[PDB]
Structure formats: structure tokens, C-alpha cells
């Protein structure tokens with residue numbers, strides 16, 4: 001957990017303009033968060049990038065978890081191996097509001113982070129999940145009580161967030 005170059009937004013929320021895969025290789029944190037779907041099919045975005053960095057080990061492991069346990073629920077999570085990126089990967093399902101899933105479940109999704117003292121994470125429900133990313137950061141700030149280091153890829157988005165928060 002040797003995080004460098006973050007800007008502290010609140011007592012427990014830190015933000016950096018970085019690729020979460022590169023952050024994970026440099027820091028080797030105890031927990032890396034994946035912005036997952038209910039079947040753990042890591043097709044693109046953050047999920048696809050983390051899976052690609054494990055050379056598909058995360059997808060083979062996720063397929064076995066689904067065959068044995070069934071899909072997650074929206075707002076839920078599971079802990080699996082972090083392979084070469086972290087000790088553990090916390091796979092969290094935020095709502096896809098573009099498909100009618102309730103925005104209130106974004107608070108439930110962020111509550112999963114409180115089960116871990118320190119996490120490296122992306123924003124949840126952003127991009128194709130359709131939530132406004134500045135709203136997602138507000139829910140994170142209001143809900144997460146443990147120490148979370150957020151990696152934001154898009155520099156234009158990072159600047160808007162730092163402008164609205166700090």
C-alpha cells in the first residue's frame with residue numbers, strides 16, 4: 001500500500017489521475033476493486049483492463065466462482081484473488097442506470113468498501129453504467145469510511161472532480 005501522488009479530498013478519500021493497473025503493479029495493495037457485472041464477465045473498461053493484466057487468470061477464477069455460487073446481486077460484492085495485482089480483488093456491482101437499475105444501489109455498492117481498511121479503486125457506475133461521475137464521487141465520500149485511493153483514468157474528468165471537491 002505505498003501510494004504516491006494522491007490528492008487528499010476528505011479524511012479518508014484520496015484521488016489520482018492514473019491507470020488502476022499501473023497503480024496496482026507499483027503498490028501491490030491488499031485490495032484492488034473491480035467495477036464488475038453480476039456474472040463477473042470482464043468484457044471491457046476497468047474489468048477488462050484488470051483481467052488483461054492477470055493474462056485471463058481473473059476471468060478463469062471468476063467463471064469457477066459463478067459456477068459454484070451463482071451471480072452477484074446489484075449493490076453486492078465478492079472477494080477473489082488479486083493474482084499479480086493485489087492480495088485480493090473486491091468485485092463490486094454498481095447499478096447500470098442506463099438499464100433501469102436504481103441509483104440508490106450506488107450507496108449499497110460503495111458500502112462494500114467498508115469491509116476493508118485500505119483499498120485501491122475506480123469510480124463506480126461511471127461511463128456505460130450511465131451515472132454522473134461527479135455524483136458517484138459524492139456518494140463515495142458520503143458512504144465510504146475506510147481509506148480509499150481512487151484511480152481516475154480520464155484527465156478531463158479528474159480535473160472536473162478536483163474542481164468540484166477541493
Ligand SMILES: C[C@H](C(=O)O)[C@@H](NC(=O)c1ncnc2[nH]ccc12)c1ccc(Br)cc1
Nearest residue numbers: 019020035046049123125126127152153154
Ligand atoms: C470514467 C472513469 C475514469 O476515467 O476514471 C472510468 N475509469 C476507467 O475506465 C479506468 N479507471 C482507472 N484505471 C483504468 N485502467 C483502464 C481503465 C481504467 C470508468 C468507467 C466505467 C466505470 Br463502471 C467505472 C469507471
